[PDB]
Amino acid sequence: MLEKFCNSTFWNSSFLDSPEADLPLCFEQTVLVWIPLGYLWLLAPWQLLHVYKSRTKRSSTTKLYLAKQVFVGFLLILAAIELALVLTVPAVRYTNPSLYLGTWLLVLLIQYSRQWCVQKNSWFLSLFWILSILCGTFQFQTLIRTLLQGDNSNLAYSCLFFISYGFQILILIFSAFSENNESSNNPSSIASFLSSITYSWYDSIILKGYKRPLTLEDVWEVDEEMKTKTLVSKFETHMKRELQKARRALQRRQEKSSQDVPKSWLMKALFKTFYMVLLKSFLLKLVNDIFTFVSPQLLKLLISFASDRDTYLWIGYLCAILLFTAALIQSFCLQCYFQLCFKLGVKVRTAIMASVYKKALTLSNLARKEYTVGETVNLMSVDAQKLMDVTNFMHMLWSSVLQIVLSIFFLWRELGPSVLAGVGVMVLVIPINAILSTKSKTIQVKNMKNKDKRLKIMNEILSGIKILKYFAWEPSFRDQVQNLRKKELKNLLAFSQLQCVVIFVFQLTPVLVSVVTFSVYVLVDSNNILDAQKAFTSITLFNILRFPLSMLPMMISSMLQASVSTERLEKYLGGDDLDTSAIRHDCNFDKAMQFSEASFTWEHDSEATVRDVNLDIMAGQLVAVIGPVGSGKSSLISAMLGEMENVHGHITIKGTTAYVPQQSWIQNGTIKDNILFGTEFNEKRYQQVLEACALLPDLEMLPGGDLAEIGEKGINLSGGQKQRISLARATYQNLDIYLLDDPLSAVDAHVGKHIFNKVLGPNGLLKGKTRLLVTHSMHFLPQVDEIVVLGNGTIVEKGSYSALLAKKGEFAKFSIYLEYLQAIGLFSIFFIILAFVMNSVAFIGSNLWLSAWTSDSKIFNSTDYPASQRDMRVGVYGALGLAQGIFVFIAHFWSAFGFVHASNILHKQLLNNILRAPMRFFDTTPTGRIVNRFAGDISTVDDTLPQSLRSWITCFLGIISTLVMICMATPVFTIIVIPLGIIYVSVQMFYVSTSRQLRRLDSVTRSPIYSHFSETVSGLPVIRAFEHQQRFLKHNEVRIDTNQKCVFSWITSNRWLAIRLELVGNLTVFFSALMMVIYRDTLSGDTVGFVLSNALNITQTLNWLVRMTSEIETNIVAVERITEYTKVENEAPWVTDKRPPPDWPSKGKIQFNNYQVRYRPELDLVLRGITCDIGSMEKIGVVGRTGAGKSSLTNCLFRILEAAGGQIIIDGVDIASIGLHDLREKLTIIPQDPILFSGSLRMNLDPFNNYSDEEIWKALELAHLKSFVASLQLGLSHEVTEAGGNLSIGQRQLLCLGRALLRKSKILVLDEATAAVDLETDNLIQTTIQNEFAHCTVITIAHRLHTIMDSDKVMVLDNGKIIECGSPEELLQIPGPFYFMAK
């Protein structure tokens, strides 16, 4: 290019050889300057028309806009001035000021233009500053040196340029800041560029979640573009276009076949709609992958630079700077790709998840019947979520190929054909990783059966805990479950070990691959000598090639799963839409309801369920339809709703329609929500229906009658109750036509009468509403306007009740972690940690040997390399290719035994503690939490936690190995770590304190989407009747969107951490490399290799140490919950040293002494000084009012409730001094509720197998249950289902009687044994009790008095006191409470 234009030298390569080297000034003022100025005038208009083409409301002139404006003005003054000195000479000397004059004017114009838009400091302007400082600094330093060197000939130019440069820095710093607009809820459209690429605008949420826990309202609205209303609209148009084009394709195929479902269209549709956001990434992965290969190729310069003491310093420093800048651009250009490629994740899930719903309301029933509710919901729960994950890394279907192919090429140059073996090992490890993953999968699945078996046994145990306590059977199940758990563990060990090898064969690959490649290359040709450049630019490349070649087998799974999951979706959205041509809604024709010789069928190609139906009804006619089953009673109403397919003839109606189903559909929420059904609250109407529906009293006993969580998961109502609610909903809405479906199905006759004459009848709410009622009840026909009896296909009678039908009636805290570690055993944790440390020491040891190996090339090369030296250096590196192998395999493996054993203690603690807890524990807390807490956590502490803990320690020592390795060369770096360490720790302390929350908010707000869809598809037919469809769509969007604002704010939070680590992972590779350049003298060329080649991987590892630390910090909450219960208090010891005589009790005499007891210390005394003496063989009945303390007395006899006062003595021995078991085995009780345990019938009778079958069979004979068991196919081995669901209530009670007769205790307590047993069985129970237990003390509690007249004495309990006690005859004579009850 021209040089006379500057009258100097453009290129003088001699200027780049001396240590003091600077670029030629002419080139420095003519090419560098043309970049930014060329940058503007080339992209000025687009960023100008794009501003005026779309016009926004001009905003206020904030303080910054003035400062950002005036500063550019000052540049114009300086730019104008420097033209004055020049004019008051080289051509370049005067044109350059002119160029700035024009440009400064323009940049002023734009900077005012941006004010209108929302994103004030966009990328275009903000980059021009950064690109006009890098291309400006070179000029800055040249002037500094020349001024310093003492020229002072161009000082006039220098001063003006200095200020011009200084202001340029100032403007940029202001550019990054963004004005806080009025609301702009999401700070994603107002954040300035430099704040929207380092995600510094998310700083608000993170420090907000550190003190005050987050909530749905504290997360910014999603956006104005990702709103599901927009996405559904956009995707719908493309979806419709492709489908119709796809439909045409099928027609040609079937036409050709003449001479199936339209497939392979969905994936095409998504492309045609998102090709902006798909393309802004493909042009952004390259810019990230290309910069992934500048970190290694620059490291070669420093190694090469340090290896020669006659290399100019500015080569090293410029390399150190680029090694930082070339890693910042990758960092920014990568995160800016994840956010831009995860956005495509949710933005595609919503486009489908929210678009499946809109098709659910339209799918023709003929196709809907193919599905079920359970699978349809999954169609957007797991089937439509695989589209997220595939879209989350769809771009790694070629980036991996590029990274692998390109990386192999770079490696090939440095090493040569030897590298083929190095890449070979990675190829070889792929299948090894694959095979074990499956073999682990089968074992995991094979274990699920055992897990289900344990829960089924346990879920029943907790409910049947009461009887468990009476007979002290606990140890039998303790062993019964312990054996089951032990069987599970033997399977578990295999699973953990198989996972150990997977970690081992992956954590060891980088160590082994180097050994193979650094052996073949130095073993093939004696000439080859490993040089520092050749090694540490290869060891680093493998760590870059490892990820793509170690994930490609995994990704292929996702991209193959999505090809079947997506296949289902097309088969769904492509379903034929329901046709409404058979029904026409209009008010023009006078009649209300009209039929035209129509016919309907439940199945398209089979018999017609409705034949030549011609019904014509006018407004206000209460018409009823009756007939037998199969004539089509329910079909007509179904036909009207349009949920049926006609054969011919049209049926048209007038006005709106209301419908009531025979099978009730109840929307989740409250009674008000269900009845109101999306309309305002009219108290007059609302109360009218409540009374007219008889629900006003039905809301009394309900805990939340006015507002209760009716529906699934909250409440269960009677069959009529839900029917009552449904008809209330139709009545309140006050529509034109009303269609009923047998409201008299499951309601009281009087109640049915009430509603009929209060709602349906002429006096009812709907006096003149066209009403159609279908049912089989003949009661209410006389009050009906017309009764069209439905014959077998058509009608028979067209008239009123008395018109024709009446003739004849003939068809009418860290402390937790220690607790977990305490379980795993401090002995093995010591060696587990130690083995890892010896592994790291070998790793740092391995690198040091490599350094002392490459050093040989300085000496040997021109001189031949002795075989002895070659065979040695290779050998040692091999002996350290195993020292790292052994100290890992013997490290992770010894851990697997540790973790499994820990899972064997925690589980053992619960059973040996929960079963010892008092009944108070189980009553207060719900049975659900115990099952869940002992289903997930106990499953979490063995299935996932150990897999996570091991990966944490192996990465922490990974970081320490690097930092110790860096410091070993340059001791000064120990200073730099303290700032970086604080920065990193202070980051983890924030991110993990929030990313844990925002994941909870995601799950808590995801379930409603599915629950809502399930409760819509189930209740679809009702919705179409009321035509409330549009209400639901707008009600599903506002619920699906409430999720995006949670997932999205999680992705960004997961992104704001990546930048502040990759910046820490660069401040540690930059400050490390810089110290190498400063300390040229003391560090040989090779030593810079391992120090700086390993530091390049610290950036990635610093993520895993934080990513995992989130899982551990959250997963371990599981073991904390388990820890809570094992520390719960427990009842008294089962066995005490003061054992009674083996024959005790001998007589059965029971004595009470001012006994007092209470359910809880906080509650009032329930027994208030009971004092009585029960003689041997005394049959006592206990009577009283409910809650008087009858039941509490029984619980005390077995010491279930500890004595608050007094005492109880049996056969002269105070039971409070005996162990509970020793007491309980000698007492027999027949519980009110005969609960049974799943398993063999023999087990239920005897859990310890302490009795022979002959004894069992006799006991059954006395229980009168022998015959039934003998009839059972397996006899004693018959399997009783859960809670004995397969046995009648009487049978279970008789079975319980069998238990009692077998035990043969001197004392027997009866607790309402015949309350729910038929008289015939009660006599059987009474007879055997009288005969079999004629020698044992009996205490009988029963609401049936007649069962107590036979007692020797009767005890009257009222309000916790004994009012009367005497024989039944004496008490009857005295006119007391017992006399009143008997009367």
The span from the CA of 1310 to the CA of 845, in Å, is 78
3-state secondary structure of 1094: helix
Tell me if 632 is assigned to a ligand binding site. Answer: yes
Return the domain boundaries, the chain.
13-197, 411-571+814-969+1121-1131, 583-807, 1132-1225+1352-1383, 1229-1332+1345-1351
Tell me if 1185 is assigned to a ligand binding site. Answer: yes
Burial class (CB in 10 A: 0-12, 13-18, 19+), 653: buried
1132-1225+1352-1383: CATH architecture? 3-Layer(aba) Sandwich (3.40)
Q: Measuring CA to CA, how many Å separate 944 from each of 439, 495, 557, 605, 890?
A: 17, 11, 21, 53, 21
3-state secondary structure of 703: coil
Q: Measuring CA to CA, how many Å separate 1020 from each of 358, 368, 987?
A: 12, 11, 50
Question: Any idea which residue has 């009143």 for tokens?
Answer: 1380
Tell me if 660 is assigned to a ligand binding site. Answer: no
Tell me if 630 is assigned to a ligand binding site. Answer: yes
Tell me if 574 is assigned to a ligand binding site. Answer: no
Tell me if 669 is assigned to a ligand binding site. Answer: no
The span from the CA of 1182 to the CA of 181, in Å, is 79
What is the residue-wise DSSP string for 411-465? Answer: HHHHH-TTHHHHHHHHHHHHHHHHHHHHHHHHHHHHHHHHHHHHHHHHHHHHHTH
606 and 787 in contact (C-beta within 8 Å)? Answer: no
Residue 424: other Cβ atoms inside 10 A: 13
b/e code 1007-1030 from CB counts within 10 Å (16+ = b)? eebebbbbbbbbebbbbbbbeeee
Non-local (6+) Cβ contacts of 774 within 8 A are 624, 625, 626, 633, 634, 636, 637, 740, 741, 742
Residue 1155, beta-bridge partner list: 1170
Tell me if 245 is assigned to a ligand binding site. Answer: no
Tell me if 1186 is assigned to a ligand binding site. Answer: yes
Tell me if 1085 is assigned to a ligand binding site. Answer: no
Dihedral angle computed from the Cα positions of residues 795, 798, 802 and 803, in that order, rounded to the nearest 10 degrees = -130
Helix (H) or strand (E) holding 1357: strand 1353-1358
686 and 675 in contact (C-beta within 8 Å)? Answer: yes
Q: Measuring CA to CA, how many Å separate 331 from each of 191, 325, 345, 966?
A: 19, 10, 21, 23
Tell me if 1239 is assigned to a ligand binding site. Answer: no
Q: What are phi and psi of 1012, to 5 degrees?
A: -65, -45
Decide whether 411-571+814-969+1121-1131 matches 1132-1225+1352-1383 in CATH topology. Answer: no
The span from the CA of 652 to the CA of 587, in Å, is 10
Write the secondary structure of 1106-1159 as one string of H (helix), E (strand) and C (coil). Answer: HHHHHHHHHHCHHHHHHHHHHCCCCCCCCCCCCCCCCCCCCCCCEEEEEEEECC
583-807: CATH architecture? 3-Layer(aba) Sandwich (3.40)
Tell me if 631 is assigned to a ligand binding site. Answer: yes
Percentages helix, strand, coil for the chain, rounded to the nearest 5? 65, 10, 30
First-to-final CA distance of the chain: 125
Tell me if 629 is assigned to a ligand binding site. Answer: yes
The CATH number that domain 1229-1332+1345-1351 falls under is 3.40.50.300
What is the residue-wise DSSP string for 1201-1266? Answer: S--SEEEEEETTEEGGGS-HHHHHTTEEEE-SS----SEEHHHHH-SS--S-HHHHHHHHHHTT-H
User: For this experimental structure, what is the resolution in angstroms?
Assistant: 3.6
Tell me if 1187 is assigned to a ligand binding site. Answer: yes
Question: Any idea which residue has 């990465």 for tokens?
Answer: 955
The span from the CA of 1193 to the CA of 1358, in Å, is 12
User: Would you give the DSSP letter of residue 598?
Assistant: E
Q: Position 697: which residue type?
A: P
1307 and 1145 in contact (C-beta within 8 Å)? Answer: yes
What is the residue-wise DSSP string for 159-204? Answer: HHHHHHHHHHHHHHHHHH-----S--SSTTSSS-HHHHHTTGGGHH
Tell me if 628 is assigned to a ligand binding site. Answer: yes
Residue 131: other Cβ atoms inside 10 A: 14
User: Would you give the DSSP letter of residue 790?
Assistant: B
Dihedral angle computed from the Cα positions of residues 186, 188, 191 and 194, in that order, rounded to the nearest 10 degrees = 150
601 and 645 in contact (C-beta within 8 Å)? Answer: yes
Sign for the CA dihedral angle at 1360, 1363, 1367, 1369 comes to negative
Nearest alpha-carbon partner for 5 in 87, 94, 89, 92: 92
Write the secondary structure of 629-643 as one string of H (helix), E (strand) and C (coil). Answer: CCCCHHHHHHHHHCC
676 and 756 in contact (C-beta within 8 Å)? Answer: no
b/e code 741-758 from CB counts within 10 Å (16+ = b)? bbbbbbbeeeebebbbeb
575 and 363 in contact (C-beta within 8 Å)? Answer: yes
Nearest alpha-carbon partner for 1359 in 1115, 1132, 1100, 1186: 1186
Method used to obtain the model: cryo-EM
Token pair for 653: 């109606």
User: Would you give the DSSP letter of residue 937?
Assistant: I
Token pair for 1328: 């055997």
23 and 31 in contact (C-beta within 8 Å)? Answer: no
What is the residue-wise DSSP string for 518-554? Answer: HHHHHHH-TT----HHHHHTTHHHHHHHHHHHHHHHH
Q: Measuring CA to CA, how many Å separate 841 from each of 845, 897, 1088?
A: 6, 24, 19
Q: Measuring CA to CA, how many Å separate 330 from each of 290, 292, 317, 336, 1282?
A: 9, 7, 20, 10, 61
Rg of the chain on CA atoms, in Å: 43
Token pair for 728: 């209330």
| CATH 1.10.600.10 for domain 411-571+814-969+1121-1131 | no
Tell me if 327 is assigned to a ligand binding site. Answer: no
Sign for the CA dihedral angle at 319, 320, 321, 326 comes to positive
Taken as a whole, the chain contains a residue count of 1383
Q: Measuring CA to CA, how many Å separate 419 from each of 516, 634, 876?
A: 9, 77, 20
Q: What are phi and psi of 601, to 5 degrees?
A: -140, 145
3-state secondary structure of 1051: helix
Helix (H) or strand (E) holding 1097: none
